[PDB]
Write a protein that binds this DNA or RNA. Structure first.
Length: 70
RNA sequence: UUAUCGGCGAGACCGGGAUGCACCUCCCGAAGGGUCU
């Protein structure tokens, strides 16, 4: 069985702290959670609630004027 | 970039019928001939 529980699973999947147990980083300190960032590279790349994610995924913009259809 | 985070998703046959065919001559004329054991 997967070691992750509902709380950890949702933290890693969608960054919602369901159990209310998460490191409440200071609001003004930008580089907060370096320990968490190192320990959990997933929560580092994509953020959790209260920790800015590191991965910025832009939109897929078409390169033409007629490239969509019904 | 006035913060921190979030796939919108899952299922579907669009198919079922039809003859396009029915009528027309393309023909009308001509010498290719003459020079060298």
């Amino acid at each position: 069985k997967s070691p992750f529980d509902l709380a950890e699973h949702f933290m890693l999947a969608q960054g919602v702290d369901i159990n209310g147990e998460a490191e409440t980083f200071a609001p003004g300190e930008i580089n907060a959670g370096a320990e968490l960032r190192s320990k959990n590279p997933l929560i580092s790349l994509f953020g959790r609630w209260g920790l800015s994610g590191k991965v910025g995924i832009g939109n897929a913009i078409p390169d033409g004027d007629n490239q969509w259809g019904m």
